[PDB]
């Protein structure tokens, strides 16, 4: 359901690991201290990640925009504690 | 006198050296015996040269030995070059400290290669500043030292500067008063104090006694 | 060292005396130091270096320096040749 | 001799203090990298020689060699080329000759000096002719038996004349035997195995031939190492078999451009001409694919189009006779950055070899060719992708220029359709700088050879090619051989080595055999014309 | 005159310091280095635990002559209890091996084969706990004034990189304050 998509993208930023380096959590850890309040994701890396996720984004964009906003803010709260 | 402890104290003194902002006693009593021991094992290469003679296997400790030799040699290189650098920056004041009676003179205890490089470098340095700017050497300006104002050649004996320190000291089995640990000291403020498990950064002056006593790591 | 012209002569005078003086200290140790170089701690023990415009060429054995030929060799001789810029990859 | 003991012997001769002391083919590079990696793992230092010049080797080996105790050479004897002159059983120095071409040089096997024959375990054969070329030849009423002996000597000499004078070609992939040998010792490295597969795929332009039965041999290795029984998802770190196709630049480019630049599809569909253009769109009309859909990158195309691709191919391409295409070729899994068939990576790396970089300028340029080799040797690592993508895209830039100049040649029809052999020359055209590399003309010639004759019966004929810009009519002319469309039917191989020896034995003014490969030679156009006349007659074939 | 840092130790220099660490191994064999401090020992029995300094183990591992045992303290469940203890301790920085950072970096280079599924498992944990430790440093770091600095428990690496900041600032504070008198 609803939260499974949030869980998929939290399992994307936290549980992606290429050869010896994880990249996206470092993107967000840099951007909060900078006071960015934003995040950039290369869609080609997303197609590189999974196959079902991309077709899901492909079908309904207006419905999947909030699951990104939720996955952004839930990780952002741990670093926000780390950072009202 | 144990090589294990000698090497331990080697890295120890190296760390202490690099952290300390100003000069420390020269350990010739130890530096010499080690410089000789390394030359002994260093020459001791001979088995490797004699190994080619048996030709009309395990070289692992061979190059390991050689490796540690040069490795330790690196350590001492940084150590000595660091001392030289410190002297270059402190040279005017250290000679002025040699001029004063009390307490401990520069000489050899606190400071041979060093004194040579010191005096020679300072010499040619004086020739370089002298021939360039002081020619052109006004009567009162002829002196290169504190006038006073402002100032010079008095820098930088600053013991007040903060630096990282780590409480470690020889156990009785003295100054351990409890409950958890030792010891009791700023001039205008009181004790905090200290514990062996945590680093407390504070003024380098109040801990100077302990460094002379070897009671606090850096 | 290792192992201009536009600047004022007094500097070169001081310079030549300085380098002569540091060679005097190199003569004193006889340790050996080798104190001006070997700044990075070694590991482990062998490295692969490529030639930088050196052909060339000798210490302990003559290795026949050849332009654009990369080797696999211990740090030792590399330390000397790098001072002349003759080696490139580290 | 057996490889194992020889290998142990070099190990015994390896470690020393002071140490030590001991271009185009990718097949050799794989074997070098795998063994090199083995010895670096054992920390065995040694020299690396990037040989370029066939005769330059004499200028270097004989120049600086002092303490030295220990694809080339199957033709030229180095004993004459160097003048080593046996000095003291237990000779002080040995030279390893790694070569896959046959027939072997006569001085190689017999008159063994540096060898240490590398023939094991490849060509036994027999090949019983060298036995009478040496055992009978050495040491070489009485008038009758003497004339009988001389007659038999000339008879065996006549037999031997056939041997060593014939076209040199590679027999089989060295990597196969080297991997078998390494696996005999027990080492199986996922990296190394994939590289073995890479080297085997590299020479596929020259069919398989044995490689067809060497498929199970690689498949066995795929069974002996099983990354996971089941996922084990993803895993973040780490090959697999897939239904591969001969189509070119599959994964990084549009299916449209893939056929557009496809060499195999080229002559059959006559892509240069306008007739087959609509036929190509007709193939897509059978595929039911929108033109705009074909232009999209392979990554963003719909999943349906993906899964149904092979069924659609099975249901459409057969109309044009393309039924034999789908193959079970291997595909590497590096996980997260995506899989690639060994063939494509090979094309990109070789493209990286050719781009991505008086007589002093030519030698300077030769030096630059060797300079580009190390960029390729560095490029062999998996992790260094940054440089690899540049070469991957430049491969497309080349193939674009290839097919373009190709159409230009198709309009003028400069081919002289002679009975002896076809002859051509490109004396002028745009973008001639790319033609300096022999490999450019190698694949270029191949791209023509399959185009002009599919076959297209009858009697496949060799093509002649040359080009020059400066340096006084260099006109590199490389030999070219016909390609059969699966219909090694015969041991034909090559012809030219003997002919080059016959014409180079004449007045040979300004001729330079400086090219390491026997098939290509530099010649003046002024003297190329009679060279052609002498080539036509007397025709050795 | 290297000039670098000169106050801080170089990261590779602290790596040179951690080289001194002894560790247990499982040699393939079933010597008498005269150099400095090993002094031990007779040829060891295969697959048997023996404590040896770090860099020699690195050598033997490069030749694959030893089987390194994984450090017992490094177990995911233990890091879980550490992170647990961290969420409930806003002030204390409790337990760290203190050299563990560089260890894990090195152990995952080669010793990775001996551990049981560390991949995509503890690596995340150490990173997570690392950053939460960093921010807890920042929360205690806002409190900084003379004369006390709470150094409590931290891996030496991070202490070294943060050194220039706090060290050079506090001096200014003390100077202006005492100087004002």
**Domain spans, chain D:** 1-227, 252-322, 341-541
**Separation between Cα atoms, residue B85 and residue E3, nearest integer Å:** 9
Residues in chain B preceding a C-to-N separation beyond 2.5 angstroms (breaks) = 44, 56, 111, 173, 184
Measured between alpha carbons, how far apart are the two ends of chain A, in Å? 30
**Separation between Cα atoms, residue E104 and residue B107, nearest integer Å:** 47
Decide if D69 contacts D234 (C-beta within 8 A): no
Of B155, B184, B207, the domain-final residue: B155
Interface test with B, best of E6, E151, E164 (most B CBs within 10 A): E151
Decide if D199 contacts D191 (C-beta within 8 A): no
Buried/exposed A19-46: b ≥16 CB within 10 Å, e otherwise = eeebebbeebbebbeeeeeebeeeeeee
DSSP assignment of C12-75, as one string? HHHHHHHHHHHHHHHHH-TTT---SS--SPP-SSEE--BBSS------SS-----TT-B--EEH
H/E element, B216: strand B216-217
| Parallel/antiparallel/unpaired status of strands D477-478 and D520-521 | antiparallel
Decide if D197 contacts D342 (C-beta within 8 A): yes
Facing residue for E131 by CB, picked from A17, A20, A82: A82
* Token pair recorded at residue B121: 């470098």
Partners of residue E30 on adjacent β-strands: none
Could you tell me how many residues make up chain B?
A: 218
Decide if D390 contacts D355 (C-beta within 8 A): no
Considering the domain architecture, whether residues B135 and B209 belong to the same structural domain is answered as no
* Token pair recorded at residue D138: 């050495």
Domain borders along chain E are: 1-181
Question: In the block, which residue shows the tokens 């030698």?
Answer: D363
Considering the domain architecture, whether residues B172 and B136 belong to the same structural domain is answered as no
Inter-chain residue contact B61 with E167, CB threshold 8 Å: no
DSSP assignment of D127-184, as one string? -THHHHHHTTTS---HHHHHHHHHHHHHHHHHHHHHTTSS--EE-S-HHHHHHHHHHH
**Separation between Cα atoms, residue E30 and residue C10, nearest integer Å:** 68
DSSP assignment of D7-45, as one string? HHHHHHTT--SS-------HHHHHHHHHHHHHHHHTT--
Decide if C20 contacts C27 (C-beta within 8 A): no
CA distances from A26 to A22, A40, B210, D303, D524 (A): 7, 12, 43, 31, 63
Residues 46-85 of B with CB under 8 A from C: 63, 67, 70-71, 73-74, 76-77, 80-81
**Contact yes or no, A with C (3+ CB pairs under 8 Å):** no
Question: In the block, which residue shows the tokens 């330059």?
Answer: D56
Q: Which of B189, B164, E12, D126 shows the shortest CA–CA distance to C39?
A: E12
Q: How far is Cα of residue D241 from the mean position of the Cα atoms in its chain?
A: 24
Could you tell me how many residues make up chain D?
A: 541
Partners of residue D330 on adjacent β-strands: D241
Interface test with D, best of C63, C74, C76, C78 (most D CBs within 10 A): C63
Decide if D436 contacts D365 (C-beta within 8 A): yes
Inter-chain residue contact E59 with C39, CB threshold 8 Å: no
Residue D327 phi, psi dihedral angles, 5° rounding: -135, 155
Considering the domain architecture, whether residues B134 and B166 belong to the same structural domain is answered as no
C40 interfacial to chain E (CB closer than 8 Å): yes
Facing residue for E171 by CB, picked from B65, B85, B162: B162
Q: Which of B202, B215, B205 shows the shortest CA–CA distance to B163?
A: B202
Residue D538 phi, psi dihedral angles, 5° rounding: -85, 125
H/E element, D241: strand D240-241
Residues of E in contact with D42 (CB under 8 A): 63
B–E CB contacts, 8 A cutoff, strictly below? 81
H/E element, B53: none
**Separation between Cα atoms, residue B87 and residue B106, nearest integer Å:** 11
Buried/exposed D86-124: b ≥16 CB within 10 Å, e otherwise = eeeeeeeebbebebbbbbbbbbbbbeebbbeebbeeeee
| Cis, peptide link before residue C28, omega less than 30° from 0 | no
* Token pair recorded at residue B98: 């040699």
Residue D57 phi, psi dihedral angles, 5° rounding: -55, -35
CA distance D42 to chain E (A): 7
Buried/exposed D328-337: b ≥16 CB within 10 Å, e otherwise = ebbbbebbbe
Residues in chain E preceding a C-to-N separation beyond 2.5 angstroms (breaks) = 30
Decide if D71 contacts D28 (C-beta within 8 A): yes
What does the CA dihedral D394, D396, D401, D402 come to, rounded to 10 degrees? 120
The number of CA neighbours under 13 Å toward the Cβ of E55 is: 18
Which chain B residue has its CA at the smallest distance from C19's CA? Answer: B121
Which chain D residue has its CA at the smallest distance from B63's CA? Answer: D17
Measured between alpha carbons, how far apart are the two ends of chain D, in Å? 37
Inter-chain residue contact E120 with D236, CB threshold 8 Å: yes
**Separation between Cα atoms, residue E83 and residue D300, nearest integer Å:** 41
Q: Which of B151, B42, B7 shows the shortest CA–CA distance to B92?
A: B151
**Separation between Cα atoms, residue B98 and residue B106, nearest integer Å:** 6
How many CB atoms sit inside 10 A of residue D471's CB?
A: 13
Q: What is the 3-state secondary structure (H, E, C) of D295-342?
A: HCCCCCCCHHHHHCHHHHHHHHHHHHCCCCCCECCEEECCCCCCCEEH
Decide if B109 contacts B26 (C-beta within 8 A): yes
* Token pair recorded at residue B23: 């000069």
Decide if D202 contacts D27 (C-beta within 8 A): yes
Question: In the block, which residue shows the tokens 């400290």?
Answer: B97
CA distance D519 to chain C (A): 27
**Separation between Cα atoms, residue B28 and residue B25, nearest integer Å:** 9
C28 interfacial to chain E (CB closer than 8 Å): no
**Separation between Cα atoms, residue B218 and residue B163, nearest integer Å:** 8
Facing residue for A14 by CB, picked from E124, E135, E138: E124
Buried/exposed D7-26: b ≥16 CB within 10 Å, e otherwise = eeebeeebebeebbbbbbbb
Resolution limit in angstroms?
5.0
CA distance E149 to chain B (A): 6
Partners of residue B174 on adjacent β-strands: none
**Residue span of the structural domain in which C66 resides:** 39-90
H/E element, D194: helix D190-202
Question: In the block, which residue shows the tokens 């220029």?
Answer: D401
Residue D330 phi, psi dihedral angles, 5° rounding: -75, 150
Decide if D61 contacts D22 (C-beta within 8 A): no
Decide if E128 contacts A29 (C-beta within 8 A): no
The number of CA neighbours under 13 Å toward the Cβ of D60 is: 15
The SS3 assignment for D454 reads: coil
H-helix segments, chain B = 3-19, 28-43, 46-51, 60-99, 113-132, 204-213
Question: In the block, which residue shows the tokens 């002196």?
Answer: B143
Q: Which of D173, D164, D344 shows the shortest CA–CA distance to D246?
A: D344
Residue C62 phi, psi dihedral angles, 5° rounding: -85, 120
Considering the domain architecture, whether residues B45 and B6 belong to the same structural domain is answered as yes
Inter-chain residue contact C46 with D45, CB threshold 8 Å: yes
Question: In the block, which residue shows the tokens 């074909």?
Answer: D294
- Chains with ≥3 CB–CB distances under 8 Å to B: C, D, E
Q: How far is Cα of residue E40 from the mean position of the Cα atoms in its chain?
A: 25
CA distance D350 to chain B (A): 41
H/E element, B217: strand B216-217
Q: Is the dihedral of CA E52, E57, E59, E63 positive or negative?
A: positive
The SS3 assignment for B198 reads: strand
| Radius of gyration from C-alpha coordinates of chain E | 21
**Residue span of the structural domain in which B195 resides:** 156-218
Decide if D168 contacts D518 (C-beta within 8 A): yes
Decide if E46 contacts E30 (C-beta within 8 A): yes
The SS3 assignment for D521 reads: strand
Q: How would you class D448 by CB atoms within 10 Å of its CB: exposed for 0-12, middle for 13-18, buried for 19 or more?
A: buried
Considering the domain architecture, whether residues B2 and B82 belong to the same structural domain is answered as yes
| Parallel/antiparallel/unpaired status of strands C46-47 and C73-74 | antiparallel
Considering the domain architecture, whether residues B96 and B135 belong to the same structural domain is answered as yes
**Separation between Cα atoms, residue D55 and residue D51, nearest integer Å:** 10
H-helix segments, D308-466 = 309-316, 342-354, 359-379, 385-412, 438-452
H/E element, B167: strand B166-167
Residues of C in contact with B117 (CB under 8 A): 21, 25
**Separation between Cα atoms, residue D87 and residue D91, nearest integer Å:** 6
Give B203-212 contacts, CB < 8 A, sequence gap 24+.
Answer: B203/B159, B203/B160, B203/B161, B203/B162, B203/E147, B203/E174, B204/B21, B204/B158, B204/B159, B204/B160, B204/B161, B204/B162, B204/B163, B205/B159, B205/B160, B207/B165, B208/B159, B211/B16, B211/B20
Counting the structural domains of chain B, the total is: 2
Could you tell me how many residues make up chain E?
A: 181
Interface test with A, best of E90, E110, E126, E135 (most A CBs within 10 A): E135
* Token pair recorded at residue B154: 């008095």
CA distances from B89 to B27, C25, D117 (A): 21, 18, 68
H/E element, D477: strand D477-478
| Cis, peptide link before residue D424, omega less than 30° from 0 | no
* Token pair recorded at residue E169: 């600032």
Q: Is the dihedral of CA D262, D268, D272, D277 positive or negative?
A: negative
Q: What is the 3-state secondary structure (H, E, C) of chain E?
A: CCCCCCCCCCHHHHHHHHCCCEEEEEECCCCCCCCCCCCCCCCCCCCCCEEEEHHHHHHHHHCCCEEECCCCCCCHHHHHHHHHHHHCCCCCCCCCCCCHHHHHHHHCCCHHHCCCCCCCCHHHHHHHHHHHHHHHHHHHHCCCCCCCCCCCCCCHHHHHHHHHHHHHHHHHHHHHHHHHC
Residues 30-59 of A with CB under 8 A from D: 44, 47-49, 51, 55
* Token pair recorded at residue D282: 């007709």
């Amino acid at each position: 359901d609803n939260t499974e998509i949030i869980k998929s993208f939290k399992n994307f930023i936290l549980e992606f690991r290429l050869d010896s380096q994880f990249i996206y959590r470092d993107q967000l850890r840099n951007n909060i201290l900078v006071k960015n309040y934003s995040l950039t994701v290369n869609m080609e890396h997303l197609i590189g990640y999974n196959e079902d996720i991309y077709k899901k984004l492909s079908d309904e964009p207006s419905d999947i925009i909030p699951l990104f906003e939720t996955a952004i803010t839930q990780v952002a709260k741990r670093i926000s504690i780390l950072s009202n | 006198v144990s090589p294990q402890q000698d090497f331990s104290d080697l890295m120890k003194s190296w760390k202490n050296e690099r952290c300390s902002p100003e000069l420390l006693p020269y350990p010739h009593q130890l530096m010499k015996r080690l410089l000789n021991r390394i030359s002994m094992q260093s020459q001791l290469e001979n088995i490797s040269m004699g190994f080619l003679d048996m030709q009309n296997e395990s070289k692992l400790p061979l190059l390991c030995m050689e490796t540690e030799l040069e490795r330790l040699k690196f350590v001492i290189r940084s150590y000595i070059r660091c001392r030289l650098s410190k002297i270059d920056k402190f040279s005017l004041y250290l000679r002025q400290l040699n001029e004063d009676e009390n307490s401990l003179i520069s000489l050899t205890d606190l400071l041979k290669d060093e004194i040579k490089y010191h005096d020679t470098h300072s010499l040619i340095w004086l020739k370089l500043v002298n021939d360039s700017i002081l020619k052109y050497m006004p009567e009162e300006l002829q002196a290169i030292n504190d006038t006073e104002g402002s100032v010079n050649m008095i820098d930088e004996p600053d013991w007040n500067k903060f630096v990282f320190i780590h409480v470690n000291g020889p156990p009785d089995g003295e100054n351990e008063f409890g409950k958890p640990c030792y010891t009791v000291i700023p001039d205008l403020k009181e004790e905090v104090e200290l514990t062996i498990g945590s680093i407390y950064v504070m003024r380098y002056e109040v801990i100077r006694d302990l460094l002379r006593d070897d009671k606090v790591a850096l | 060292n290792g192992l201009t012209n536009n600047l004022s002569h007094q500097e070169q005078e001081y310079l030549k005396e300085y380098c002569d003086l540091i060679t005097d200290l190199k003569s004193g140790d006889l340790v050996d130091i080798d104190l001006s170089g070997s700044l990075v701690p070694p590991s482990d023990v062998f490295i692969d270096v490529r030639v930088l415009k050196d052909a060339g060429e000798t210490e302990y054995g003559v290795f026949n320096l050849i332009k654009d030929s990369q080797f696999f060799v211990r740090q030792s001789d590399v330390e000397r040749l790098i001072q002349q810029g003759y080696l490139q990859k580290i | 001799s057996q490889f194992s003991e020889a290998y142990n012997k070099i190990l015994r001769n390896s470690s020393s203090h002071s140490s030590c002391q001991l271009c185009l083919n990718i097949d050799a590079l794989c074997a070098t990298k795998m063994l090199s990696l083995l010895f670096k793992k054992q920390l065995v230092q040694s020299q690396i020689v990037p040989i370029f010049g066939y005769s330059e080797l004499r200028r270097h080996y004989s120049q600086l060699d002092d303490n030295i105790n220990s694809g080339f050479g199957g033709v030229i004897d180095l004993e004459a080329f160097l003048e080593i002159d046996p000095q003291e059983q237990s000779f002080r120095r040995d030279i390893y000759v790694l070569d896959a071409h046959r027939p072997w040089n006569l001085d190689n096997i017999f008159g063994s000096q540096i060898i240490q024959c590398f023939d094991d375990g490849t060509v036994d054969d027999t090949l019983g002719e060298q036995k009478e070329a040496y055992y009978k030849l050495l040491e070489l009423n009485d008038l009758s038996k003497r004339k009988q002996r001389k007659k038999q000597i000339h008879e065996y000499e006549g037999v031997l004349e056939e041997y060593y004078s014939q076209g040199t070609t590679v027999v089989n992939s060295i990597s196969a035997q080297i991997y078998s040998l390494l696996s005999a010792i027990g080492e199986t490295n996922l990296s190394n195995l994939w590289l073995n597969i890479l080297g085997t795929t590299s020479l596929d332009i020259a069919y398989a031939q044995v490689y067809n039965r060497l498929y199970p041999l690689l498949q066995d290795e795929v069974k002996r190492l099983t990354p996971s029984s089941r996922n084990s998802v993803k895993t973040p770190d780490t090959l697999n078999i897939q239904p591969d196709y001969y189509l070119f630049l599959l994964r990084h480019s549009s299916l449209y451009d893939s056929f557009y630049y496809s060499n195999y599809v080229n002559a059959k569909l006559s892509l240069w001409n306008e007739n087959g253009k609509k036929r190509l769109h007709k193939m897509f009309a059978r595929m039911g694919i929108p033109l705009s859909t074909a232009q999209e990158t392979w990554l963003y195309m719909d999943h349906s189009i993906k899964r149904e691709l092979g069924i659609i191919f099975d249901k459409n391409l057969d109309r044009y006779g393309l039924q034999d295409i789908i193959r079970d070729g291997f595909v590497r899994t590096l996980g997260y950055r995506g899989s690639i068939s060994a063939s494509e990576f090979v094309e990109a790396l070789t493209a990286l070899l050719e781009v991505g970089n008086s007589a002093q300028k030519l030698t300077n340029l030769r030096k630059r060719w060797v300079s580009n080799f190390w960029l390729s040797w560095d490029a062999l690592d998996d992790r260094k992708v940054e440089l690899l993508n540049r070469g991957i895209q430049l491969a497309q830039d080349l193939q674009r220029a290839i097919f373009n100049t190709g159409v230009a040649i198709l309009e003028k029809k400069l081919i002289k359709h002679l009975r002896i052999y076809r002859l051509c020359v490109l004396q002028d055209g745009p973008d001639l700088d790319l033609y300096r590399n022999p490999l450019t003309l190698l694949r270029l010639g191949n791209w023509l050879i399959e185009c002009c004759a599919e076959s297209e019966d009858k009697q496949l004929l060799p093509m002649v090619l040359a080009s020059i810009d400066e340096n006084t009519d260099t006109y590199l002319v490389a030999g070219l051989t016909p390609r059969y469309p699966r219909g090694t039917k015969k041991p034909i191989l090559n012809n030219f080595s003997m002919a080059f020896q016959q014409i180079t034995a004449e007045t040979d003014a300004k001729v330079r055999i400086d090219n390491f490969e026997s098939s290509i030679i530099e010649i003046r156009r002024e003297d190329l014309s009679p060279f052609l006349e002498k080539l036509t007659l007397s025709g050795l074939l | 005159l290297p000039a670098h840092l000169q106050q801080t130790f170089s990261p590779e220099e602290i790596q040179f310091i951690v080289e001194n660490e002894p560790i247990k191994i499982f040699p393939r064999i079933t010597w008498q280095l005269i150099t400095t401090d090993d002094k031990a020992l007779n040829n060891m029995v295969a697959m048997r635990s023996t404590e040896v300094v770090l860099w020699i183990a690195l050598l033997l591992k490069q030749q694959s002559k030893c089987s390194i045992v994984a450090p017992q303290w490094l177990t995911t469940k233990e890091l879980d209890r550490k992170i647990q203890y961290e969420k409930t301790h806003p002030d204390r920085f409790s337990e760290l091996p203190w050299n563990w950072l560089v260890l894990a970096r090195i152990l995952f280079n080669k010793a990775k084969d001996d551990f049981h599924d560390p991949i995509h498992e503890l690596r995340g944990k150490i990173q997570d706990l690392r950053e939460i430790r960093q921010i807890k440093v920042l929360k205690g770091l806002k409190y900084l004034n003379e004369s006390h600095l709470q150094l409590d428990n931290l891996s030496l690496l991070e202490i070294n990189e943060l050194r220039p900041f706090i060290t050079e600032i506090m001096d200014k504070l003390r100077e202006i304050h005492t100087a004002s008198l």
